[PDB]
Structures are given as structure tokens and as C-alpha cells.
Amino acid sequence: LKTKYANEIIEIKRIMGEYNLLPDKNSRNGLKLLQKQADLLKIIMEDTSVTENTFKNIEIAITDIKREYYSHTVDIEKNIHAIWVAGSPPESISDYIKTFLKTYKEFTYYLWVDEKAFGAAKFTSVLKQIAFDLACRTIQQNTPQKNIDFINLYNEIRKKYNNNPSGQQEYLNKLRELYATYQKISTPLKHMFNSFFLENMIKLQDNFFNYCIVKGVTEINDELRINYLKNVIKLSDDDIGNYQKTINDNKDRVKKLILDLQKQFGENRISIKDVNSLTSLSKSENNHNYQTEMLLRWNYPAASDLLRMYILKEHGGIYTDTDMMPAYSKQVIFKIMMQTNGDNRFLEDLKLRRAISDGVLRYVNNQNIDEVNYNEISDADKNIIKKILTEISKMPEDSIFTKINTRIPRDTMPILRRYHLWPDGWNIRGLNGFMLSHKGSEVIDAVIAGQNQAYRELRRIRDNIHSEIYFKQTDELSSLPDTDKIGGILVKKYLSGSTLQISGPDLIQRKMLQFFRSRGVLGEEFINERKLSDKAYIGVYKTTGTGKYDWLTPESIGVNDVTPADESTWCIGKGRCVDDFLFKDVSTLKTENLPELFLTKIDTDTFFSQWSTKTKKDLQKKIQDLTVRYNELIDSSTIDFKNLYEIDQMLHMIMLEMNDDIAKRSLFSLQVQISEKIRRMTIPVDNIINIYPDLHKKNDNDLSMSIKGFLASNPHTKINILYSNKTEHNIFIKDLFSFAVMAFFKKHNENIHNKIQRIKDEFKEYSRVAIHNIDKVIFKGQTLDRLYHEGYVFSDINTLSRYTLHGLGITGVHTEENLLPAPSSSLINILKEHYNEDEISAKLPLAYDYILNKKESSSIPVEILNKLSELPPHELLTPVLGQSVNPLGMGYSSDNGKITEQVIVSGADGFDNPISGLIYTYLEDLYNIHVRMREGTLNSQNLRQLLENSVSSCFLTEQSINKLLSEAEKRPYQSLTEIHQHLTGLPTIADATLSLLSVGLPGTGKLLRREQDYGRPPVTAIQDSTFVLPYNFKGIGFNDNIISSAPVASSLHFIAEHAKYTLLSWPEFYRHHAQRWFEMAKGYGSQNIDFHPQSLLVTQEGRCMGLALLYLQTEDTAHYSILQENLMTVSALHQTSNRDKLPLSKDDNSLMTRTYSLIEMLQYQGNKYITNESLLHKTAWNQERITLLFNEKGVKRALISTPNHTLVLQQLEDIYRLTDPNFGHADFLSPIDALKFIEAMIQLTPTLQEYYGLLNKDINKHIQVHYAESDMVWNKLLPENDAGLSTRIQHTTTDRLANLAEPVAVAGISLPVKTLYDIGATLDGRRITSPPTSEQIPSLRLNGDVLNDYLSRTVLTPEQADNIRKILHTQGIRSGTRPIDPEMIRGTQDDLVSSQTRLQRQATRVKQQLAGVLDTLQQHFQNIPRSSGRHLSVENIELADIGSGRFNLQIRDGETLHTTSVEVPEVVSRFQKLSTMLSALPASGIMDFDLGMSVVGVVQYARLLQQGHMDIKQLSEATLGSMIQIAGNKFLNTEGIQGFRLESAVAEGMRSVATRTGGTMGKALSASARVLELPVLETVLGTWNLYNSVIQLQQATSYSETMAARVQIAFD
């Protein structure tokens, strides 16, 4: 093992050498080196082949280094800090203070007084009153179905107060009784009350911080607080009077207390320290958590929990609470016991302990001893206490109390331990009311970071827009600040006036535990069984003999906390003060000044009412021009960055050019509304993950695990592994050159090639896992290409590549780490049955190993493994899908509130991305600076140019320029990130993103940046994280816990491998059922039935949840109509692009991509929501129950789910609209009719019933209704941003070109630009968006496919056909497309247009039938018991059943398998109908022109197949032709004449038809028959042969598309 551990042994020797050469071993450096020593020695222990002698030697060494570690102790400063809490009586305060001044003779006392927050109480009270009133109002409005008696009582007692302001105590008593009443309200109502109260209160705090931002204040003092109150509410003179008296009473109280103390002990011994002289109060990392704490608190009589952290951090010493004495003396406890004749009861019960402490305090302060409160104590106990106090009263005052050990281990913060014998039993816990430290402890730093993190997770309710309101987390004392219980605590405290702690002993203990664990092996004496031991506390007591703790001789001297003024004395003994409350009528709230809680419009009638005359007469005209633009920007469901930029820039310029402060505040409110709109309107993320791993890293397991986890988390997740060969080649070359400065080429080359081959072939079978080379994705002119070319070796090259590769269109999640999916709530719940939250994260690696792989770990119980195996892996992990990002298009990981670049999540394809463009320009600027710095020719002016015409020149300050030149002269070669750091001063380019954007968004960008100082999340940082690092299994979000807020698993609707309908054959489903759908809806009383079938989803995967949620979003008829229009447009575009393979304009490919991403994400979210019972109530199908919900429970929207489809029930206006995505919608007057029609339409029709999954099933148990408890939950669920799909009618290119009235002169003929686009005019590689200039006309080409489709769809006039032929002759067909024979371009006269049109219709219909039939035929051919070989060679196609279309097929597969049953009624029924009309025509003159055209088209198609003259697809085609011929033979041949042909028979039939009717239609029939009689035209045969020879093979489409093309050729 010596050679195996040689490197670590050398490391140990180096560490010993460094430790020996240390000027001060008593410093954090030496402690870290000894911790590293212990960790390395434990790693040595991890070796299996270790001898017992080695065990003993290492044990001796470990004991020695541990003893050396524990010898580095520090002496705390002789400071005693006690925070003064407003309203505290000085007398009761002084006594204990006096005590602490007497026992600790050589110490200093600092009363930490904050004069600026003396009134904060009566402000926070007003804020709380406003928040509760807002919650009450929104709760009452949210549930019109019933009234709440408690709210009526609250309002009535407030109005009763509004008559008598003198009776405050009566009002608080009435509030207590009303809380007793409020206890009896329903659990959902209570839950919503708590959530709304907490949210409103956080919003009000954020509003105050925004006021601080606008006023440009540096310190928040009372005056600022009384101005903000005047801003939000109307203050009377008596209310401003009260706020001041408190700030006067508090001042005199602390001044008189300190004077009375100073007269006796001196000014030096006790001094007042101003809390505001703390650096931590002004620290930006602290997010001003102390001001929020002043509001988000429920233990006001107690001191602050962050203040003590700051004080101990910045001054050290001992923090103590006001209400403690020092511990007793040994002699004192000895005489305590010796007056009890062996009775130990006196020293553990609280009553006698408190009485004795009261007695000793009264004696020590030279007060009378007999005056102790002897209530609730028996006469014998009172007598004995009187005597024992009389005994303790003889001894000197100096021999009563005892001091504590002042020398503590370095970077440790001892905590008081408390014992309390409760009637049930013992209570032992840690308390933060007495703490020790020395200045600059790192444990205090960890605890402060933990408190900030806790405040972040508490703010998560308001920060996280996707925060599930109704999710009842089980009470488990989780680390997370569970929001519901905190809100309940606050509501109880606000109502009654009298557990959980965000910042408290629980958090301090947890953070100390984490720190001691991170310390290493040296923390073992502090940690026991996943908890801090007695060596981390003071006052611990040993049990000796029996379980009783030996009260004499403590292990560690503590502090006496059972006090007359303990935490249990002001509940009853000390009455509640009234100077911490200020009654305020919130009915006159100024809502126009509250953008956070209320979204206000800019209405000119009262926006300027409060403006002064000068600013009005100057800027009112400029503002009113913004009314329409600002209103349309705010009310929009999409973000248009041009309008946002222009509106914000002009608002900022208006604000800069004015001196008023009221008007400035109104425009700041507009800016804040804009910023909130930006925060809310988030966009989906592409379901793609790209990993940019190290290629010479030794580890491989982590990357493989990440790929497997992301494959299993969802079957649609595309995984990209991006590597650069040039980077590794340059790295090897640089290594070789360095080795030269101070035959490995073959070894390195084989190593890298082998590793890449291994990763490539180990996921070879997965098509989603793609390994890409970055050298072949980027262009030659890009920055990254030059970076590789000149040999950029710096470690940043990877991160830059991510940015580069996001500019090339590669969307999704870019990462350099082996990132893993987050566990879902189901896996967490499974693990919670055995492990606790501090062990779940450590056991998660084993769970992931057993889920992704099949490895079983003996360190986990078999029950957990079995519970894991029963679930799909996609139910235990969280996919990329369903995650959303900021509308700016980039998100970043966070780390304690500071965004990082570990993960770069990058919007979605088709969505606008400002940060992408800004990043690209910035990277080019950095490259230019770098290249001109390399030579050393950069000076100021060169930089001025290098940054001209770029937003990055904003960073060009004098100090930045000086630093850039200084670094250039210091060392000429510098990396890009270091260059950006020099130029901007920011650590990461992610940090520079908001600075770059601020140029185009002044004010709003500045406001969003300033929000980060007040706790608000960075706009570019993601909050919900669905990923976890492998090395700690910790989330990457802003405010998230992956073990207590884990996401809910979303069920995936697995579907059969064969689909009933394809894209080509889909419209048949709607066509066959549309008439019955209409008649069913009309039969039940519907009065508005509209048909907008969807063509976006033809496979029932996802159960059409996206369109259902889209239709559910709308609450108005107008928005519904708009949404229906854009959905029809997108379905038409999808049909054009995918069914017809027609290229689309880049301005409609983006619209379709946006709609598809939105639908996919909403479908994922809806599937997740329906399965989660706590989110939406789910009920079985019952018409009575659903009618009851929609009539009495006040439900407005609901989802009706069959096993395969989703329907939408809505309450738009006064009608109930049922929406079926495939059939449109129908509205009914009453819910009962809607439910009845739903039942009838799903049940009566057989094919519809089978398609929906309800065939041969009881619909009463397979139809489920999902609804929400409150309507606004949908507002929380359904997203506000939707790419404008429900607010503005999106326009296609064709619509925009149709508006242009100027024609283009091409080839000597002037034609409209719309028509030029229609024939497929191709600008360069793409099509025409804008009218080409005169010079671009020679460059125009024509796309063959688009021209073919245009001709097939349109009935041109002869001159139009001549013009198109001329254009084709002049400008040729675009290369690579379908050639179009000019002779095929013909036009028709007016009289034969209708008929012509109808023919075209038939073609489509026939295609959409034949294609479907072919699939069945193909399907029929795929079920053959054939023994491979693909030689079916069917040799008989006879038909048996005429009324069913049954063909007896004798198949010569080599085994003579003969399947004499095929159900093809499509082919036989048409020929049947044509035969019966022909035979009965002389009696029945009814003339169906469409049927005749379809028959002539199918006959012509069959004839063309015959002239064409054997795999499954082509054999199915041939058989279909043969069956058309067989049905024609059967139905048309009156007698069995051999000398017949279908062409002549059909043509003669139609010629007779035309001879009967005559007219234009008769002429069309005769022309079609004549076409059938004469042989096929040379042009038609040439087209057919060229297609089948080149075009069919060149395309990769399936056989259905080729068959549809052939049917189209025949119909043409």
C-alpha cells in the first residue's frame, strides 16, 4: 500500500512541513491543516488491507493530533452584550444586570440600543393590520358561495372600535374572544388565511423596500417609516403623536436606566452601544433581514436572533439575555440541599427553583427577603423556603454566584443547555439566550449564512410564482420553514396576542452540527448520534447512581435560567403592553401606491390628480401618449421587447428630466409594475440537456450515471455530450511544450480515443444520447473558432463554449458537471419511512444507484428497495420537462443567493432571447480586447474604439480603464474571464448580463439590480431546481430544498405502439363524427356549436392535456374566440409543414415551435396536477354531484378525463361551454344539459367510445372530474405567459403579405406579392418575407413542392397559368425540389371552376381514405405468422362479403398461409354506391357529382398502377389497386364478360349520366369520362415515372405519403 498511498503520504509530509513553518499555530490555517491530516488518516483507514499494528500506530497518531488540536483555545473578550428590547421596564432589567456586573468583576457590559427602531412596533402593527385586512377581503371575495361569520365579527369589532379609540384593552380582549371563535373555521379556509396573510405581509415589506429604493435612503429610521406610512395610509395627528411618544418614552427609559446604573457602577463598566454601528446591518449579503424580522416575528417580548449573531461576530465576548442570573455556588447548592434532609425535589421543579431564585435576587439587590412571591406554593414549602433563604442570607454577596470558563476552543460558540422537569417528564434543550464566542469565529459565519438561507426559504412563498398553495406537508419538524404552520402562528399571534422558529436555537443547533461535520474527524467529540454532544454546550449535568443529574459539581458551569422574569412570567404575571400596537382603519388604503399587491392601470382621469401644477403642465401630455402602449404592454400575455424597451426608455428619460417627488413616485410605481410583469411572465424550457465534460478526467461512473438518470427520468429527454478535439489537442501540445521548458503522444491519443469510444458505444443503443464534436458545430468566423485556432488553453474555454453553443440554437440545459435529476416527492416519501432529513440526503446516492442501476446496497433495508422497485424510474426522478425560465431567456444556478455558472438553463427554441444577443456581442468585445492586449498595443483610445458601437462601453470608466491597462502592462497574456473581471469588476459573465441589458432597459434594469440588495431573487436565477449535484446531492435553485420541497411525480400516459390515426388519416376521424357531434349537441338544447378540430396531436399520448389547459385558461368569450383562432392557425401550419413537407417562413416556424413547446409543457403540468389529489379535487362521474359542484360549491372550470381524452367544462359568462379539442365546443344554458350531452356523446357512438378508451367499460367509474377548491388556484396554476396565444391574433406571413397593395414586376408581368409567395418564391435559401427589390428578381427561384401544392389547391384562370409558366421558364425551379412540367400548369374557365374545385376536394378525401386503408392493409400484413423472408406474394384477391368489404386473400409466403378476411369497406362501398346510382339512375335522377369524381379518380389511379407494372408497403399498394379493380368488376359488370375494362365501363356510365342531365356539370362529367377513354397523356405518364423513379426514393417519408402523392397525380 506504500506505493498506492505514496502521493497521500507525500501530501502528509508536505502538510507537516507547512505546519512546522507556521508563525502562529493558533490560527485557522493550522486548524485546517490538522483537519486535513485527520481526514487523510481516515482515508487511510478506508483501505481494506490494513494490519492491526498499523491500526494501533494510526490510532496513537490520531489521538496525538487530536490532543494537539484541542490545545488551541482562545480567551473570549471581556464584553457582555445585552440587547435592549423596546418597552422593557428599566427596574426589572437592572437587577439581573447589576448581578452580572458584580460576579464578572473584570468585564465590560454593553447595552445594545437601537434608537431608530424604537417605534418599529407600532409600524409593523399597522403593516400587519393591512395585510390581515387584505387577506380577509380576498378570502371573502374568493368564495362567493358562502359567507364567513368570523370575518363579519372581525369587521364589526373594528367598526365598533372606530367609534371609541380609548378602549384598546377592550378591543384586544374582543380580538381574543374572536380568535376563539375563529378556531372553528374549516381547514381549507384556515390554510388559505395563513397563506394569504404571510404573502400579503411579505409583499408589504417589499413595497417598503421599494420606497427605500426610490427615496435613495442609506439608513432606515423611524422618520422614513412614518413617511412611508403616510404614503400607504392616511395618518392622523394623534397617530403621528403616538408614534413619537413611544420614541420619547423608550428614549427616557433607556437613558434613566443607564443613568441609574452609571451612578453606581460607572460609565466605563457599563456603556450603551448603538446597534446601527454594525457593519452587518449595512451588509448587502444580509438582504436587510433585520427589518423583515421586525415584521416576520411572533416572539416580540424576546430579543432579536440576527442581532446577537451580528454582535458576537463583530465584537465577541458573551451574549446574554436580560432575564438570567449566573449559576449558583457549590456552597449555595450545598446549603440548598442540607436544609432538605436529602430532598432533591427542590432543585428540578420549576416552582421551588423560581421561588429560590427570586429570593436570592431579592437578597443580592439589598431588597427585603420576605417579599418573594409565594403563590402556588404550599404552606410547608413556603415555610421551608423562607428558612432556607434565611440560611443563605448570612453569606457574602460575592460567594453566591459563579463564573463560567472563558477559554473556549477556537472557532466554537458554546450554547446554554436547559433542563426542565415538566409534569409529563424531562425537557432538555439548547437555548440561544446565553452564548459565548470570540470575534471572527467562522461558526458564527456559518450560522449567519444559515439564517439568511432560512429567510430566503421563508420568502419562497412570495418569490416562487410556482409555489403550490394547497400542499399539506406532514408535521415532522423539518429543517424547512414550513410556510403553512408559520402563517398559522402569525395569525394566532395577531388575533389572540399570544414552537416553530425560522432563526432560533433549532437553526443554530442545525448549523453548528453542519459546521462541525464539515470540520472533519476533529468534530467527533462535539457530534453524537447525528446531534451535538455535551461538549458543544454549557451547563450539562451528569447522571450519577440513579438517572438523576448530580446537581453539585457540573461538567460545565452554566447560567441560571429559571428566573422570576423567565419566559413563563410575562404570559400572565406581566400584562401585555399597549404601546406596541396602533389601531388603523385600513378601509382608506391608498391602493394607487401599491404596485406589489395591486396591478393598477394608467388612467388619465386620476393619474395626475395628485401632481403639482408645474409637473402636470409639463409632462402630462408626454405621459398620456404612454397610456395605450403601457396598458397594452401590461395586459399582454406575451412580452414584446421592442415595446418594452421603448416604453421603459422613454419613462426613464421622463423621470430624469423632472424635479418633483410625488410624480417621480408615480412613475416609479409604473416601473415597478413593469418589473413585476417581467418577473411573472416566465417561459418554458426545451426538454434537452447538454453536458460538456472533461475528456481526460479519470472518473467515468458519474457521467454514465447522469446520462442514465436523464434517460430514465423521461423517455423524451435528449442528451448531448459535447466535446472538442481541438481543445484536447491544444492541451496536450501545451503540456508537451511546458515539459520541454522544464512518446506520450501515442499514449494520450489512444487514451482519449478509447474513452470517447467507450462513452459512445455504452449508450450506443439510445438515439437520444448524441456525442457531438464542438469543432464541427461552430462556423469559421465565430469567436470560439478563433479561440481554438490560436490555442486558447485557459480553463474558461468550456464555459464560453456553452454561451457560443447557445447562440447556435442548441437550447436546453448546458452544464459542465455530471448533474443528476432531482428526486421526486414519491422517492422522498419512500425514504422518509425509515430515515430522517439529516440522513435522507446521505442515503440518496444509494437509492439513485439502485434506481438507475440494479446494484443492491446492504446499507439500506430490503423493504425500501422493494418499495422502490415497484415504481417506474420516471416516477421517482424529475425530468427537464416542466421547468420554466425568465422571459429574458437565461437562468443560472444560485449559491446562497449569488448566481453561478454551474448550470446555464437557456429558455426555449422559438422564444425571444435578448441575453443571447447581448452575450454574443459582449464575447466579441472581450475577444477584441484580448487579441489587442496580447500584443500590448492597447491604450485608452484603442479601448474607446474596441468598445464603440457596443453596450459594453458602459463599463468603460476611468478606474476600469486604469485597471485594464495596468493588467495589460503587468502580464500581456490574459484570459477572457479575467479580462471581463478587469473591465467590469463582476465575477461572472452571468453577473454582467443584467448590466448589459440595463443599457436597453434603464431604470427597470437598475430597479431589478437594486432589488437584489433587499432579498429579492436575481431575475436571471432559477428558483425551482430539478437538478442535483452528485457530490453533495444539493439543489441548484435560489430558494429550494430537495429533501423537503421535492417536486411531485408526474404520471406518464404510456400508449400502444400502433396508432389508430396518423397525420394523413387524422381528418377522417373528425369528418365521420362531425355531423353526429353537431346533432347530439343540438339534440340536448345547445344553441352555439362551433367546430375547430385540432390537428396538432393525432396520438393520444398525454390525453390532449395541453389544449385542454389552453382552453381552460380563458375566462371570457372574446379571449376564447381569439385562442380558437390562433389554434386553428397553428394546426393549419402544422399540417402544411409536417403532412405536406412544405418549408415554412422563419416567422411562422417560430410561432409553431413556441406553440408546441407551450402545449408540451402544459400537458406535462396538467398530468402532474390531475394525479395529485391535494391540488385538484377529483370525483367520479356523477351528473348529480357535478351539477351540485357547479351550482352550490361555486365551481367555474373543470376537466373531464376519460382514460384517453380530456374535455373542458367552463362557466364563461352565463353559459356553460363544453370543449372537445378534436370537435370544437358547444355551449348550454345549464350544467345538467352539458353533462347529459357529454355522457351521450361519449357513450352512444361506438368508434368515439373506443377511441376515448370507454369501450365495454362502465363510464360511471372511468370518467373523472377534476376541479379546484377555489377558482384563483387556477390563476396560480395556469401560467400568465402564453406566447400571446390567447390575447392577440397571431398573423402568418400570408396574412401580412396580403396587406401589401403593391405588385412586383417579375419576368415582365406585375403580380401581387402574396401570389408570388404562394407559388413558392424563394429568397436565397429561404422564402420571401418582404417584397424583393429590382435587383433581387434575377436571384428569385421557385420551390417545386410549394408550386405543386399551390397548383393542386387552386383553380387558376388561363392567363394566370400562362403567367406562372412564364415565371417558371424565366426563373427555374429551386434545386433539390420537385420538378414541375410546364405543360401540367393549365387554367380553367369560369363556367367549370366549381366542378373543378369539387374535384380537388375529392382528391384530398380519397387520399385521407386510401392512406388509412393502406395502413390497415400494412397492419394486416404485419400479423402474418410468416417466417420472415418478406415474400408474401399474395396470389388471389377474391372477395366474399359485399356488405362488409371482405376479401379472401390467398398468400404464397412459402407456407401457404391464407387469411381470407380483410375488412376494407372504404374501397367496396364507393364502387357499390356508384353501381347503384348508375343502375337506378333512370328512375332516380339524383346526381352526386362528387361521388362520380371520386370514382373516376380512383379508377384512373388503379389504371395508372396497372400501367406501372415485393416488400410489405409496395405489396399493400398493389393489393389495394387489385381490390379496387375487383370491386369494380363485381359492381359494374352486369354480365360476366371477359372483354371489359373499368375505364370504358365507368366512362360509358358517366357519358350516359351526362347525356341525361346535360349542362355544365354534365360537360364536366363527359370530359372526365373522355379522359378515361383516351390513353394516359404523355405528360401524365412522364410525371408518374419521374416521381416513382427519383422523387419517391429521394424522400425518406413513409409509403402513405408516396401513395397520397400518386393519388394526387391521378386526380390532377
1415 is in an annotated binding site: no
Strands laid side by side in the 688-691 sheet: 769-773, 718-723, 688-691, 812-815, 898-906, 891-895
Question: Which residues face 271 on adjacent strands?
Answer: 110
Q: Rounded CA gap, 1266 and 1381, in Å?
A: 57
Strand ranges, E, within 705-805 = 718-723, 769-773
Reading the block at residue 1187, the C-alpha cell is 351539477
SS3 877: strand
Whole-angstrom CA distances from 690 to 257, 722, 1156 are: 66, 7, 21
Angle at 1511 between CA 1509 and CA 1514, to 5 degrees: 45
Strand ranges, E, within 66-155 = 73-75, 79-83, 108-113
From the list 743, 716, 727, the residue with the least C-alpha distance to 812 is 716
The residue type found at 147 is: N
Q: Residue 569's Cα: distance from chain center in Å?
A: 47
Residue 542: HSE in the Cβ half-sphere, 13 Å Cα cutoff: 9
Q: Convert 1339-1374 to b/e letters by CB count within 10 Å (16 or more is b).
A: ebbbbbbbbbbbbeebbbeeeebebbbbbbeebebb
Under 8 Å between Cβ of 631 and 601: yes
From the list 1369, 1085, 1051, the residue with the least C-alpha distance to 1236 is 1085
566 is in an annotated binding site: yes
Under 8 Å between Cβ of 149 and 180: no
Q: Are strands 718-723 and 769-773 parallel, antiparallel or unpaired?
A: parallel
Q: Are strands 898-906 and 1197-1201 parallel, antiparallel or unpaired?
A: unpaired
Q: Rounded CA gap, 132 and 144, in Å?
A: 19
Q: Rounded CA gap, 1524 and 1530, in Å?
A: 10
> Backbone dihedral region of 358: left (phi > 0), alpha (psi from -120 to 50 degrees) or beta?
alpha
Reading the block at residue 560, the C-alpha cell is 441560571
Q: Rounded CA gap, 1142 and 1159, in Å?
A: 22
Sign of the CA dihedral with 74 first, then 79, 80, and 86 last: negative
Question: Residue 1391: how many CB atoms within 10 A of its CB?
Answer: 12
SS3 320: strand
Give, as one character, the DSSP assignment of residue 245. H
Under 8 Å between Cβ of 555 and 542: yes
Question: Which residues face 1178 on adjacent strands?
Answer: 1266
Contacts of 614 (CB under 8 A, 6+ apart): 660
Sign of the CA dihedral with 1364 first, then 1367, 1373, and 1374 last: negative
Under 8 Å between Cβ of 1093 and 1233: no
SS3 1410: helix
Reading the block at residue 921, the C-alpha cell is 456581442
Contacts of 1480 (CB under 8 A, 6+ apart): none
Give, as one character, the DSSP assignment of residue 1587. I
Sign of the CA dihedral with 1231 first, then 1237, 1243, and 1246 last: negative
Reading the block at residue 1041, the C-alpha cell is 430544498
Contacts of 307 (CB under 8 A, 6+ apart): 83, 112, 275, 290
Q: Rounded CA gap, 1330 and 762, in Å?
A: 49
* Binding site as annotated, residues: 321, 323, 566-567
* Binding site as annotated, residues for Mn(2+): 321, 323, 566-567
